[PDB]
Amino acid sequence: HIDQLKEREYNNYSWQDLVASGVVEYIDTLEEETVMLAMTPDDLQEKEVAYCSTYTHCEIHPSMILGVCASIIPFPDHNQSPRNTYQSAMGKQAMGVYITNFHVRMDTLAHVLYYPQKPLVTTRSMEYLRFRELPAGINSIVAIASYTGYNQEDSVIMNRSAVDRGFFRSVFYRSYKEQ
Amino acid sequence: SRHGQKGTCGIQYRQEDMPFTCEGITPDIIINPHAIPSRMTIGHLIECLQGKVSANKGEIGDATPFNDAVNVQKISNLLSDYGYHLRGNEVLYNGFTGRKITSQIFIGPTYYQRLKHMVDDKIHSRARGPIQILNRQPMEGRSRDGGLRFGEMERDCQIAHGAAQFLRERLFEASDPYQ
Amino acid sequence: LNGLTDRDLCELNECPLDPGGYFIINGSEKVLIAQEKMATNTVYVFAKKDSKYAYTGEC
Amino acid sequence: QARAGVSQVLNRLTFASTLSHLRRLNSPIGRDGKLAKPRQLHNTLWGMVCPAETPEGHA
């Protein structure tokens, strides 16, 4: 199956063929009550004490529990969970390029970042969110240091000479209408 | 920062004033270490370390959650091959004096986001602007040259101060003087 | 826009990456938000600590 | 009398904001409702609803 999926662009073998082959099944919450889930195929292996020997299904990848905005977070399993919730809010407030055809649009408010970068550290879910193609930020060299005290209590010091070179520069468009 | 670490820019220093590594890298952003320990956003530190490996190696680092093949020790070992201290610290020099800083500083590439919240959309001030037709008190909001509300809790605060003349000014002379 | 290629969408000044899934009313882009409701045709039994019925079964 | 907020202006601040707005779900409990129970992360959301993405206000 994987070897057929790896040439999906040539053989026209698809996700639909994978469901039609009886390999993948759609399961609802009410049917999950009756299902026995392996978190990975490593749960299917023989073990020195067997927790369960009668699994019915396996997860594809555990990270699919996340939604769009939470999927942008790298290493979210190493954060206290409210901080993942706050990122899931603030990622919707980040400037980027919001859509490619923005030049024809007359949105009342629009922010466009000059130099979006894709992140150097990415989840694999970010491929499907097109974040690689409409990114909303810049990879910044960050030092974690006290220095002169102007960064205390959730504040940051920026390099003015980087800002002169266009770091985090943006354009703001406001549209007016009259008849 | 993608890890719920938000802040406002407190000051900007030019490149000669920022701290520098022995090779002349200055941070783009300095963030305070007191942001970390109660937030436990360790994913931020691992992102920084992985990003430092990523930029040296020339590969986009995988930070997908639940990947047992990636851990802090493996990232540290990869970093040690590029001639850096394995935990991401570097010796920084003070930009003002040139002296080495006694503590070595954790430094590396971290993805940052500019949020739509900018100070020039928020700054406001009023003195004797327009008033509402019905109650003749100051208008509401920046976009109307409005006055800030001196509320009941502020009233109670000035009562507890005993500031009877200032309370009179704010609840009469500065709002709706009439005869 | 259905079935159009990226080139056809660009010729119409549309964005290939735009997902659709929204309406345009008076020029404003309007999205419908999914509404949770209790499922129909199912017997649920509930109880409450402070009412004149011991148990209620609703369909 | 009609239920409000079922249609909203599509958020266009950034592409993630657009995608997430198209995938939004609402529980019509009412923003002022003080009961914690429908706001808790129920176990059965596993793989159905994102555990992290919720607005940190009254909603």
Binding site: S14, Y128 | - | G21 | -
Partner: peptide, 29 residues
Amino acid sequence: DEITPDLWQEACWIVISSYFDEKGLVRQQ
């Protein structure tokens, strides 16, 4: 033809990619 643990991480992301190539993100709308 069992997928061994060394192949599993590429295999499951091939599967997920095939899903998103088919369905996309707004399929339910």
